[PDB]
Design an enzyme around this catalytic site. Structure first.
Site, short mmCIF file in Angstrom:
data_model
loop_
_atom_site.label_atom_id
_atom_site.label_comp_id
_atom_site.label_asym_id
_atom_site.label_seq_id
_atom_site.Cartn_x
_atom_site.Cartn_y
_atom_site.Cartn_z
CG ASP A 99 -1.94 1.08 1.13
OD1 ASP A 99 -2.84 1.02 0.35
OD2 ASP A 99 -1.77 2.03 1.83
CE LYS A 144 -4.01 4.65 0.53
NZ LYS A 144 -2.61 4.49 0.87
CE1 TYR A 190 0.22 7.74 3.08
CE2 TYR A 190 0.79 5.64 2.23
CZ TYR A 190 -0.10 6.46 2.81
OH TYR A 190 -1.30 6.03 3.14
CG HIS A 231 -5.29 9.35 0.42
ND1 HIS A 231 -3.95 9.33 0.20
CD2 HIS A 231 -5.47 8.81 1.64
CE1 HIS A 231 -3.34 8.83 1.24
NE2 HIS A 231 -4.24 8.51 2.12
N1 LIG Z 1 -6.20 5.49 3.45
C1 LIG Z 1 -5.69 6.09 4.47
O1 LIG Z 1 -6.15 7.13 4.77
C2 LIG Z 1 -4.67 5.50 5.39
C3 LIG Z 1 -4.55 6.03 6.64
C4 LIG Z 1 -3.68 5.50 7.54
C5 LIG Z 1 -2.91 4.43 7.19
N2 LIG Z 1 -3.04 3.91 5.98
C6 LIG Z 1 -2.26 2.77 5.51
O2 LIG Z 1 -2.31 1.72 6.39
C7 LIG Z 1 -1.14 1.47 7.04
C8 LIG Z 1 -1.70 1.49 8.45
O3 LIG Z 1 -0.74 1.69 9.40
P1 LIG Z 1 -0.42 2.91 10.22
O4 LIG Z 1 0.90 3.21 9.89
O5 LIG Z 1 -1.29 3.92 9.92
O6 LIG Z 1 -0.63 2.10 11.52
P2 LIG Z 1 -0.22 0.71 12.10
O7 LIG Z 1 0.14 -0.20 11.14
O8 LIG Z 1 -1.33 0.29 12.80
O9 LIG Z 1 1.00 1.06 12.94
C9 LIG Z 1 2.35 1.02 12.59
C10 LIG Z 1 3.24 1.01 13.83
O10 LIG Z 1 3.33 -0.26 14.40
C11 LIG Z 1 4.63 -0.56 14.71
N3 LIG Z 1 4.62 -1.98 14.50
C12 LIG Z 1 4.46 -2.56 13.35
N4 LIG Z 1 4.44 -3.86 13.49
C13 LIG Z 1 4.60 -4.13 14.76
C14 LIG Z 1 4.69 -5.33 15.59
N5 LIG Z 1 4.62 -6.55 15.12
N6 LIG Z 1 4.88 -5.14 16.87
C15 LIG Z 1 4.97 -3.95 17.38
N7 LIG Z 1 4.89 -2.84 16.73
C16 LIG Z 1 4.72 -2.87 15.43
C17 LIG Z 1 5.44 0.14 13.69
O11 LIG Z 1 6.77 0.39 14.03
P3 LIG Z 1 7.99 0.14 13.13
O12 LIG Z 1 7.64 0.63 11.88
O13 LIG Z 1 9.02 0.87 13.74
O14 LIG Z 1 8.12 -1.25 13.15
C18 LIG Z 1 4.67 1.38 13.55
O15 LIG Z 1 5.13 2.22 14.56
C19 LIG Z 1 -0.32 2.67 6.67
O16 LIG Z 1 1.07 2.52 6.75
C20 LIG Z 1 -0.83 3.11 5.35
O17 LIG Z 1 -0.25 2.39 4.30
C21 LIG Z 1 -3.90 4.40 5.11
C1 LIG Z 2 -1.51 16.62 7.87
C2 LIG Z 2 -1.99 15.87 6.61
C3 LIG Z 2 -1.51 16.62 5.34
C4 LIG Z 2 -0.37 15.80 4.77
C5 LIG Z 2 -0.80 14.41 5.02
C6 LIG Z 2 -1.31 14.43 6.47
C7 LIG Z 2 -2.03 13.17 7.05
C8 LIG Z 2 -1.57 11.89 6.34
C9 LIG Z 2 -2.38 10.61 6.57
O1 LIG Z 2 -2.09 9.66 5.54
C10 LIG Z 2 -3.87 10.89 6.57
C11 LIG Z 2 -4.71 10.16 5.79
C12 LIG Z 2 -6.16 10.30 5.70
O2 LIG Z 2 -6.75 9.58 6.79
C13 LIG Z 2 -6.46 11.77 5.88
C14 LIG Z 2 -5.89 12.32 7.19
C15 LIG Z 2 -4.37 12.08 7.41
C16 LIG Z 2 -4.15 11.77 8.90
C17 LIG Z 2 -3.56 13.32 6.95
C18 LIG Z 2 -4.01 14.65 7.55
C19 LIG Z 2 -3.52 15.78 6.65
#
Ligand SMILES: NC(=O)c1ccc[n+]([C@@H]2O[C@H](COP(=O)([O-])OP(=O)(O)OC[C@H]3O[C@@H](n4cnc5c(N)ncnc54)[C@H](OP(=O)(O)O)[C@@H]3O)[C@@H](O)[C@H]2O)c1
Ligand SMILES: C[C@@]12CCC[C@@H]1[C@@H]1C[C@H](O)C3=C[C@@H](O)CC[C@]3(C)[C@H]1CC2
Length: 313
Positions: A41, A75, A46, A108
Protein backbone atom coordinates in the site's frame (compact mmCIF):
# COMPACT_ATOMS: atom_id res chain seq x y z
CA UNK A 1 -6.44 -12.91 -1.16
CA UNK A 2 -9.99 -11.67 -1.13
CA UNK A 3 -11.52 -11.76 -4.63
CA UNK A 4 -12.88 -8.47 -6.03
CA UNK A 5 -15.93 -7.79 -8.17
CA UNK A 6 -13.32 -7.73 -10.86
CA UNK A 7 -12.62 -11.47 -10.45
CA UNK A 8 -9.11 -10.33 -9.49
CA UNK A 9 -7.12 -11.30 -6.37
CA UNK A 10 -6.12 -8.72 -3.72
CA UNK A 11 -3.84 -10.30 -1.18
CA UNK A 12 -5.43 -10.22 2.26
CA UNK A 13 -2.30 -8.96 3.94
CA UNK A 14 -0.16 -6.13 2.62
CA UNK A 15 2.55 -3.76 3.80
CA UNK A 16 1.63 -0.23 4.72
CA UNK A 17 4.02 2.59 3.91
CA UNK A 18 2.79 5.72 5.64
CA UNK A 19 5.57 7.35 7.82
CA UNK A 20 8.08 4.78 6.48
CA UNK A 21 11.18 6.98 6.15
CA UNK A 22 13.53 7.38 3.25
CA UNK A 23 16.38 5.05 3.75
CA UNK A 24 14.44 2.39 5.65
CA UNK A 25 11.53 1.84 3.32
CA UNK A 26 13.43 0.14 0.48
CA UNK A 27 14.80 -2.45 2.78
CA UNK A 28 11.41 -2.80 4.46
CA UNK A 29 9.84 -3.55 1.07
CA UNK A 30 12.70 -5.98 0.13
CA UNK A 31 12.26 -7.85 3.40
CA UNK A 32 8.52 -7.83 2.90
CA UNK A 33 8.77 -9.58 -0.48
CA UNK A 34 11.20 -12.28 0.77
CA UNK A 35 8.82 -13.00 3.57
CA UNK A 36 6.04 -13.50 1.01
CA UNK A 37 4.14 -10.17 0.96
CA UNK A 38 2.81 -9.27 -2.49
CA UNK A 39 0.38 -6.43 -1.68
CA UNK A 40 2.02 -3.12 -0.91
CA UNK A 41 0.00 0.00 0.00
CA UNK A 42 1.39 3.31 -1.20
CA UNK A 43 0.50 6.94 -1.52
CA UNK A 44 1.76 10.03 -3.25
CA UNK A 45 1.40 11.93 -0.01
CA UNK A 46 3.82 9.48 1.73
CA UNK A 47 6.66 10.99 -0.31
CA UNK A 48 8.54 7.69 -0.54
CA UNK A 49 7.13 5.88 -3.60
CA UNK A 50 10.38 6.22 -5.57
CA UNK A 51 12.17 4.36 -2.87
CA UNK A 52 9.38 1.74 -2.86
CA UNK A 53 9.84 1.52 -6.64
CA UNK A 54 13.55 0.85 -6.35
CA UNK A 55 12.79 -2.05 -4.02
CA UNK A 56 10.29 -3.59 -6.43
CA UNK A 57 12.38 -3.22 -9.61
CA UNK A 58 15.23 -5.00 -7.83
CA UNK A 59 13.39 -8.04 -6.68
CA UNK A 60 11.79 -8.23 -10.07
CA UNK A 61 15.01 -8.43 -11.98
CA UNK A 62 16.58 -10.37 -9.23
CA UNK A 63 13.85 -12.88 -10.00
CA UNK A 64 12.58 -13.13 -6.51
CA UNK A 65 9.12 -12.21 -7.89
CA UNK A 66 7.05 -11.62 -10.99
CA UNK A 67 5.10 -8.42 -11.55
CA UNK A 68 1.78 -10.18 -12.13
CA UNK A 69 2.19 -11.73 -8.68
CA UNK A 70 2.61 -8.26 -7.12
CA UNK A 71 -0.42 -6.05 -6.21
CA UNK A 72 0.48 -2.44 -5.83
CA UNK A 73 -1.84 0.23 -4.63
CA UNK A 74 -1.58 3.99 -4.57
CA UNK A 75 -3.93 6.88 -3.98
CA UNK A 76 -4.96 10.21 -5.27
CA UNK A 77 -4.68 13.17 -2.94
CA UNK A 78 -7.56 15.63 -2.72
CA UNK A 79 -5.66 18.67 -3.94
CA UNK A 80 -5.33 16.96 -7.31
CA UNK A 81 -8.96 16.28 -8.28
CA UNK A 82 -8.97 18.68 -11.26
CA UNK A 83 -8.57 16.65 -14.35
CA UNK A 84 -5.17 17.74 -15.64
CA UNK A 85 -3.80 17.30 -12.03
CA UNK A 86 -5.26 13.83 -11.64
CA UNK A 87 -3.01 12.78 -14.46
CA UNK A 88 0.09 14.62 -13.26
CA UNK A 89 -0.36 13.01 -9.84
CA UNK A 90 -0.77 9.59 -11.36
CA UNK A 91 2.25 9.86 -13.65
CA UNK A 92 4.44 10.93 -10.74
CA UNK A 93 3.13 8.02 -8.70
CA UNK A 94 3.55 5.58 -11.61
CA UNK A 95 6.97 6.86 -12.59
CA UNK A 96 8.30 6.88 -9.02
CA UNK A 97 7.08 3.33 -8.57
CA UNK A 98 8.89 2.37 -11.85
CA UNK A 99 5.77 0.48 -12.89
CA UNK A 100 3.92 0.32 -16.16
CA UNK A 101 0.59 -0.23 -14.39
CA UNK A 102 -1.04 -0.05 -10.93
CA UNK A 103 -3.35 -2.73 -9.70
CA UNK A 104 -5.62 -0.36 -7.79
CA UNK A 105 -5.76 3.44 -7.65
CA UNK A 106 -7.80 5.04 -4.87
CA UNK A 107 -9.18 8.36 -4.01
CA UNK A 108 -7.53 9.05 -0.69
CA UNK A 109 -10.06 11.32 0.98
CA UNK A 110 -13.49 12.28 -0.38
CA UNK A 111 -13.50 16.07 -0.07
CA UNK A 112 -11.69 18.03 -2.67
CA UNK A 113 -9.26 20.60 -1.42
CA UNK A 114 -7.93 23.83 -2.78
CA UNK A 115 -5.31 23.13 -5.39
CA UNK A 116 -1.69 24.23 -4.99
CA UNK A 117 1.12 23.22 -2.75
CA UNK A 118 -0.46 22.99 0.60
CA UNK A 119 -1.37 19.36 0.85
CA UNK A 120 -3.66 20.45 3.65
CA UNK A 121 -4.63 24.04 2.80
CA UNK A 122 -6.45 25.90 5.57
CA UNK A 123 -7.92 29.25 6.45
CA UNK A 124 -6.53 31.38 9.22
CA UNK A 125 -9.15 29.50 11.22
CA UNK A 126 -7.24 26.22 10.95
CA UNK A 127 -10.10 24.88 8.86
CA UNK A 128 -9.59 23.28 5.46
CA UNK A 129 -10.19 24.99 2.17
CA UNK A 130 -12.46 23.28 -0.38
CA UNK A 131 -11.61 23.21 -4.14
CA UNK A 132 -13.53 23.28 -7.46
CA UNK A 133 -13.49 19.62 -8.55
CA UNK A 134 -15.33 16.94 -6.60
CA UNK A 135 -14.44 13.23 -6.17
CA UNK A 136 -16.90 12.44 -8.95
CA UNK A 137 -14.85 14.52 -11.30
CA UNK A 138 -11.78 12.77 -10.11
CA UNK A 139 -13.31 9.38 -10.66
CA UNK A 140 -14.01 10.31 -14.24
CA UNK A 141 -10.45 11.19 -14.85
CA UNK A 142 -9.44 8.02 -13.00
CA UNK A 143 -11.75 5.98 -15.15
CA UNK A 144 -9.80 7.09 -18.11
CA UNK A 145 -6.74 5.37 -16.65
CA UNK A 146 -8.39 1.99 -16.53
CA UNK A 147 -9.45 2.29 -20.23
CA UNK A 148 -5.78 2.80 -21.13
CA UNK A 149 -4.58 -0.28 -19.30
CA UNK A 150 -2.58 1.90 -16.82
CA UNK A 151 -4.73 1.11 -13.78
CA UNK A 152 -6.65 -2.16 -13.39
CA UNK A 153 -9.27 -1.06 -10.90
CA UNK A 154 -10.33 1.81 -8.84
CA UNK A 155 -11.23 2.15 -5.20
CA UNK A 156 -12.07 4.63 -2.51
CA UNK A 157 -10.75 5.39 0.96
CA UNK A 158 -12.34 7.17 3.90
CA UNK A 159 -15.79 7.09 2.31
CA UNK A 160 -19.05 6.62 4.23
CA UNK A 161 -21.93 4.72 2.72
CA UNK A 162 -23.24 8.05 1.62
CA UNK A 163 -20.25 8.73 -0.56
CA UNK A 164 -20.31 5.26 -2.01
CA UNK A 165 -23.98 5.65 -2.81
CA UNK A 166 -23.32 8.92 -4.46
CA UNK A 167 -20.61 7.31 -6.56
CA UNK A 168 -22.48 4.12 -7.59
CA UNK A 169 -25.42 6.35 -8.70
CA UNK A 170 -23.35 8.56 -10.94
CA UNK A 171 -24.53 8.83 -14.56
CA UNK A 172 -21.99 7.44 -16.99
CA UNK A 173 -20.22 5.39 -14.43
CA UNK A 174 -17.80 3.30 -16.37
CA UNK A 175 -16.02 1.60 -13.42
CA UNK A 176 -17.07 0.52 -9.93
CA UNK A 177 -15.01 0.81 -6.76
CA UNK A 178 -13.34 -2.43 -5.73
CA UNK A 179 -12.52 -1.60 -2.17
CA UNK A 180 -13.04 1.01 0.51
CA UNK A 181 -9.86 1.43 2.54
CA UNK A 182 -10.69 2.64 6.06
CA UNK A 183 -9.44 2.56 9.60
CA UNK A 184 -10.52 -0.61 11.31
CA UNK A 185 -9.49 -2.45 14.51
CA UNK A 186 -11.00 -3.63 17.80
CA UNK A 187 -11.56 -0.01 18.97
CA UNK A 188 -13.20 0.93 15.62
CA UNK A 189 -15.01 -2.22 14.40
CA UNK A 190 -16.93 -0.70 11.58
CA UNK A 191 -19.76 -3.32 11.55
CA UNK A 192 -22.30 -1.34 9.58
CA UNK A 193 -19.90 0.08 7.04
CA UNK A 194 -18.52 -3.40 6.31
CA UNK A 195 -22.05 -4.86 6.12
CA UNK A 196 -22.84 -2.14 3.64
CA UNK A 197 -19.78 -2.58 1.49
CA UNK A 198 -20.12 -6.32 1.30
CA UNK A 199 -23.80 -5.98 0.30
CA UNK A 200 -22.47 -3.99 -2.73
CA UNK A 201 -19.63 -6.34 -3.65
CA UNK A 202 -17.02 -3.88 -2.35
CA UNK A 203 -14.25 -5.17 -0.17
CA UNK A 204 -13.01 -3.35 2.85
CA UNK A 205 -9.29 -2.67 3.43
CA UNK A 206 -8.40 -1.94 7.08
CA UNK A 207 -5.78 0.67 7.74
CA UNK A 208 -4.06 1.43 11.09
CA UNK A 209 -4.75 -2.09 12.23
CA UNK A 210 -2.31 -1.74 15.07
CA UNK A 211 -3.49 1.61 16.23
CA UNK A 212 -1.00 3.72 14.41
CA UNK A 213 1.24 4.44 17.50
CA UNK A 214 3.73 6.43 15.53
CA UNK A 215 1.22 8.82 14.32
CA UNK A 216 2.60 12.22 15.31
CA UNK A 217 -0.50 13.33 17.23
CA UNK A 218 -0.61 10.29 19.47
CA UNK A 219 -1.55 11.48 22.94
CA UNK A 220 -0.48 9.31 25.91
CA UNK A 221 -4.05 9.11 27.21
CA UNK A 222 -5.05 7.65 23.84
CA UNK A 223 -6.16 4.05 23.80
CA UNK A 224 -3.42 1.57 22.97
CA UNK A 225 -4.25 -1.69 21.16
CA UNK A 226 -0.75 -3.10 21.20
CA UNK A 227 -0.70 -3.06 25.03
CA UNK A 228 -4.38 -3.97 25.59
CA UNK A 229 -4.33 -6.60 28.37
CA UNK A 230 -7.21 -8.61 26.99
CA UNK A 231 -5.75 -8.66 23.39
CA UNK A 232 -2.41 -9.81 24.82
CA UNK A 233 -4.26 -12.40 26.86
CA UNK A 234 -5.62 -13.97 23.67
CA UNK A 235 -2.26 -13.64 21.87
CA UNK A 236 -0.54 -15.54 24.67
CA UNK A 237 -3.20 -18.24 24.40
CA UNK A 238 -1.94 -18.83 20.83
CA UNK A 239 1.77 -18.25 21.45
CA UNK A 240 1.47 -15.21 19.20
CA UNK A 241 1.96 -11.49 19.56
CA UNK A 242 -0.77 -8.90 20.07
CA UNK A 243 0.10 -7.56 16.57
CA UNK A 244 -0.47 -11.02 15.14
CA UNK A 245 -3.87 -11.22 16.79
CA UNK A 246 -4.92 -7.73 15.70
CA UNK A 247 -4.04 -8.59 12.12
CA UNK A 248 -5.78 -12.00 12.11
CA UNK A 249 -9.02 -10.43 13.41
CA UNK A 250 -9.56 -8.79 10.00
CA UNK A 251 -8.83 -11.86 7.95
CA UNK A 252 -11.45 -13.85 9.77
CA UNK A 253 -13.86 -11.19 8.90
CA UNK A 254 -12.95 -11.19 5.22
CA UNK A 255 -11.32 -7.82 5.43
CA UNK A 256 -7.99 -6.88 3.91
CA UNK A 257 -5.38 -5.61 6.30
CA UNK A 258 -2.24 -3.57 5.77
CA UNK A 259 0.01 -3.11 8.83
CA UNK A 260 2.97 -0.90 8.60
CA UNK A 261 6.53 -1.54 9.56
CA UNK A 262 10.16 -0.74 8.68
CA UNK A 263 11.55 -3.17 11.30
CA UNK A 264 12.54 -6.39 9.51
CA UNK A 265 11.66 -8.69 12.39
CA UNK A 266 8.17 -7.20 12.70
CA UNK A 267 7.56 -7.10 8.97
CA UNK A 268 8.06 -10.89 9.14
CA UNK A 269 5.98 -11.39 12.31
CA UNK A 270 3.09 -9.48 10.84
CA UNK A 271 2.56 -12.13 8.10
CA UNK A 272 2.87 -15.26 10.26
CA UNK A 273 -0.90 -15.01 10.57
CA UNK A 274 -2.00 -17.91 8.38
CA UNK A 275 -1.00 -20.60 10.90
CA UNK A 276 -3.51 -20.03 13.65
CA UNK A 277 -7.19 -19.43 14.19
CA UNK A 278 -9.02 -17.28 16.69
CA UNK A 279 -12.13 -19.08 18.00
CA UNK A 280 -15.64 -17.70 17.80
CA UNK A 281 -15.53 -16.59 21.43
CA UNK A 282 -12.33 -14.84 20.64
CA UNK A 283 -13.78 -12.92 17.69
CA UNK A 284 -16.92 -12.07 19.62
CA UNK A 285 -14.83 -10.87 22.59
CA UNK A 286 -12.55 -8.81 20.38
CA UNK A 287 -15.55 -7.39 18.52
CA UNK A 288 -17.04 -6.18 21.77
CA UNK A 289 -14.09 -3.79 22.36
CA UNK A 290 -15.51 -1.31 19.90
CA UNK A 291 -15.24 2.25 21.17
CA UNK A 292 -15.78 4.25 18.02
CA UNK A 293 -12.31 5.51 18.47
CA UNK A 294 -10.39 6.88 15.58
CA UNK A 295 -6.69 7.28 15.49
CA UNK A 296 -6.78 9.21 12.22
CA UNK A 297 -9.04 12.09 12.77
CA UNK A 298 -6.76 15.04 12.16
CA UNK A 299 -8.57 16.90 9.25
CA UNK A 300 -11.82 17.71 11.00
CA UNK A 301 -13.37 19.23 7.93
CA UNK A 302 -16.96 18.95 9.08
CA UNK A 303 -17.86 22.30 7.50
CA UNK A 304 -17.00 21.16 3.98
CA UNK A 305 -19.19 18.86 2.02
CA UNK A 306 -19.00 15.11 1.99
CA UNK A 307 -17.33 14.75 5.35
CA UNK A 308 -17.13 11.08 6.00
CA UNK A 309 -16.84 10.78 9.77
CA UNK A 310 -19.93 12.58 10.98
CA UNK A 311 -22.26 9.90 9.62
CA UNK A 312 -22.93 6.64 11.50
CA UNK A 313 -21.41 4.48 8.68
N1 LIG B 1 -6.20 5.49 3.45
C1 LIG B 1 -5.69 6.09 4.47
O1 LIG B 1 -6.15 7.13 4.77
C2 LIG B 1 -4.67 5.50 5.39
C3 LIG B 1 -4.55 6.03 6.64
C4 LIG B 1 -3.68 5.50 7.54
C5 LIG B 1 -2.91 4.43 7.19
N2 LIG B 1 -3.04 3.91 5.98
C6 LIG B 1 -2.26 2.77 5.51
O2 LIG B 1 -2.31 1.72 6.39
C7 LIG B 1 -1.14 1.47 7.04
C8 LIG B 1 -1.70 1.49 8.45
O3 LIG B 1 -0.74 1.69 9.40
P1 LIG B 1 -0.42 2.91 10.22
O4 LIG B 1 0.90 3.21 9.89
O5 LIG B 1 -1.29 3.92 9.92
O6 LIG B 1 -0.63 2.10 11.52
P2 LIG B 1 -0.22 0.71 12.10
O7 LIG B 1 0.14 -0.20 11.14
O8 LIG B 1 -1.33 0.29 12.80
O9 LIG B 1 1.00 1.06 12.94
C9 LIG B 1 2.35 1.02 12.59
C10 LIG B 1 3.24 1.01 13.83
O10 LIG B 1 3.33 -0.26 14.40
C11 LIG B 1 4.63 -0.56 14.71
N3 LIG B 1 4.62 -1.98 14.50
C12 LIG B 1 4.46 -2.56 13.35
N4 LIG B 1 4.44 -3.86 13.49
C13 LIG B 1 4.60 -4.13 14.76
C14 LIG B 1 4.69 -5.33 15.59
N5 LIG B 1 4.62 -6.55 15.12
N6 LIG B 1 4.88 -5.14 16.87
C15 LIG B 1 4.97 -3.95 17.38
N7 LIG B 1 4.89 -2.84 16.73
C16 LIG B 1 4.72 -2.87 15.43
C17 LIG B 1 5.44 0.14 13.69
O11 LIG B 1 6.77 0.39 14.03
P3 LIG B 1 7.99 0.14 13.13
O12 LIG B 1 7.64 0.63 11.88
O13 LIG B 1 9.02 0.87 13.74
O14 LIG B 1 8.12 -1.25 13.15
C18 LIG B 1 4.67 1.38 13.55
O15 LIG B 1 5.13 2.22 14.56
C19 LIG B 1 -0.32 2.67 6.67
O16 LIG B 1 1.07 2.52 6.75
C20 LIG B 1 -0.83 3.11 5.35
O17 LIG B 1 -0.25 2.39 4.30
C21 LIG B 1 -3.90 4.40 5.11
C1 LIG C 1 -1.51 16.62 7.87
C2 LIG C 1 -1.99 15.87 6.61
C3 LIG C 1 -1.51 16.62 5.34
C4 LIG C 1 -0.37 15.80 4.77
C5 LIG C 1 -0.80 14.41 5.02
C6 LIG C 1 -1.31 14.43 6.47
C7 LIG C 1 -2.03 13.17 7.05
C8 LIG C 1 -1.57 11.89 6.34
C9 LIG C 1 -2.38 10.61 6.57
O1 LIG C 1 -2.09 9.66 5.54
C10 LIG C 1 -3.87 10.89 6.57
C11 LIG C 1 -4.71 10.16 5.79
C12 LIG C 1 -6.16 10.30 5.70
O2 LIG C 1 -6.75 9.58 6.79
C13 LIG C 1 -6.46 11.77 5.88
C14 LIG C 1 -5.89 12.32 7.19
C15 LIG C 1 -4.37 12.08 7.41
C16 LIG C 1 -4.15 11.77 8.90
C17 LIG C 1 -3.56 13.32 6.95
C18 LIG C 1 -4.01 14.65 7.55
C19 LIG C 1 -3.52 15.78 6.65
Amino acid sequence: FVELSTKAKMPIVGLGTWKSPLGKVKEAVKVAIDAGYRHIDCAYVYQNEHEVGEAIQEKIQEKAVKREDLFIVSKLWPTFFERPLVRKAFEKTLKDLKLSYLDVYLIHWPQGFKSGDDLFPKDDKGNAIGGKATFLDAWEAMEELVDEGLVKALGVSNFSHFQIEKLLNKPGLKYKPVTNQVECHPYLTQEKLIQYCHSKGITVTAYSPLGSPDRPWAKPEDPSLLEDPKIKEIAAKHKKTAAQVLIRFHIQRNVIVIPKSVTPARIVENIQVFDFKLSDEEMATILSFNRNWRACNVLQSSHLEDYPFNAEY
